[PDB]
Amino acid sequence: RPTFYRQELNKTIWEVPERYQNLSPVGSGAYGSVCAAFDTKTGHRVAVKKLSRPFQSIIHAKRTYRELRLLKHMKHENVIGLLDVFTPARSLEEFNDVYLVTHLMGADLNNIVKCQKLTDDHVQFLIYQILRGLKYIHSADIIHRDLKPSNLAVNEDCELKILDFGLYVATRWYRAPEIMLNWMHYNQTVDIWSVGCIMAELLTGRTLFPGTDHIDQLKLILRLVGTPGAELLKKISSESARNYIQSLAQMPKMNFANVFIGANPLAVDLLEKMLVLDSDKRITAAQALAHAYFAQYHDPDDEPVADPYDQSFESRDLLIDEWKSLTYDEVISFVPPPLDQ
Length: 341
Ligand SMILES: CCNC(=O)[C@H](CCC1CCCCC1)NC(=O)c1ccc(CNC(=O)c2cnn(-c3ccccc3)c2N)cc1
What we know:
The chain is built from eleven helices and ten strands. It has helices at residues 58-73, 109-115, 120-139, 190-204, 214-225, 230-233, 239-247, 256-259, 265-274, 285-289, 320-332, and strands at 4-9, 12-17, 20-25, 34-39, 44-50, 84-86, 99-103, 107-108, 152-154, 160-162. It has a five-stranded antiparallel beta sheet with strand order 3-4-5-7-6, with no helix packed on it. Strands 8-9-10 form a three-stranded antiparallel beta sheet. Helix 1 packs parallel to helix 11 (320-332) and helix 3 packs antiparallel against helix 4. It binds ligand OU2. The ligand CCNC(=O)[C@H](CCC1CCCCC1)NC(=O)c1ccc(CNC(=O)c2cnn(-c3ccccc3)c2N)cc1 is lined by residues 26-27, 31, 34, 47, 49, 67, 70-71, 74, 79-80, 100, 102, 104-105, 107-108, 137, 144, 153, 162-164, 166. Residues 26-27, 31, 34, 47, 49, 67, 70-71, 74, 79-80, 100, 102, 104-105, 107-108, 137, 144, 153, 162-164, 166 line the site of the ligand CCNC(=O)[C@H](CCC1CCCCC1)NC(=O)c1ccc(CNC(=O)c2cnn(-c3ccccc3)c2N)cc1.
């Protein structure tokens, strides 16, 4: 067990191994309780996140367990990964705090679109990397569900990672119509809707669908993609939703080339395939990676899938001390990634 040292930072106590030096808070709460630090073992900058009240309730405890399980799973260049996880606790009985260590990223995509107006080449490479990470995530039966520009981070080399910072940019702006009202008929392609929204915004400099609420959001979406026809209406189970959609005056599908005027036609074609209202018909991440828009980047021998992920815990209803002990197990069994790079 290494030697820890203690300090106070913006109201909070931090107790971390000596290996991590010069802790300085970043992001002013946007990222949670996170410090940049220098990792003396690799000579690299890292991010250290201290979980906030990880075991305060059954719900926090489960969320803590879930976050650690997800992070320990992710081994891919376009998804955030776990460099280390530690607690100052010597036993299960005194286990109360959880620290997670990851690579430190340079900037989020929200801040980047807000600053700059990106080239078609940069949009190609950024959306390619998102999709490549999504192929991976989705292969493990994991759905992100909250993809938006502030959950994507890039380094100066334009290398991108998918993250989730959890609770400026409204989630609802990027959320798929089928999970706007109810959560009944949805698949991994909710994430592909989000990618379409993100890609639109990178291309134009403008939130594609800036709805004020769930109802407005849906109205903005239908104005672009058109009100559902007979076929898709047949698959809506919710009376109130179908009533709502059918109570609107009909709107035709827009021609996306008339909306994203001057964009690469291949970008426009992919957008048409991502922003389809029928989630059974929306392009998957794997299919999208083969789209001609990514011809410069796509290599089918280097778009890996994930190992299987045991999500059976999600259906369980356990006590706080049980979720805590499971989380402890996961801290203890953590094997760090190989150093070398
Ligand atoms: C709701 C809580 N979510 C989670 O459970 C997920 C679990 C893993 C997900 C990964 C993506 C797929 C879905 C699972 N958890 C994390 O993603 C997750 C966990 C821990 C960390 C810690 N790292 C940072 O905070 C960090 C790194 N770079 N920068 C940086 C700096 C400047 C500018 C821009 C960025 C940060 N601020 C980072 C993400």
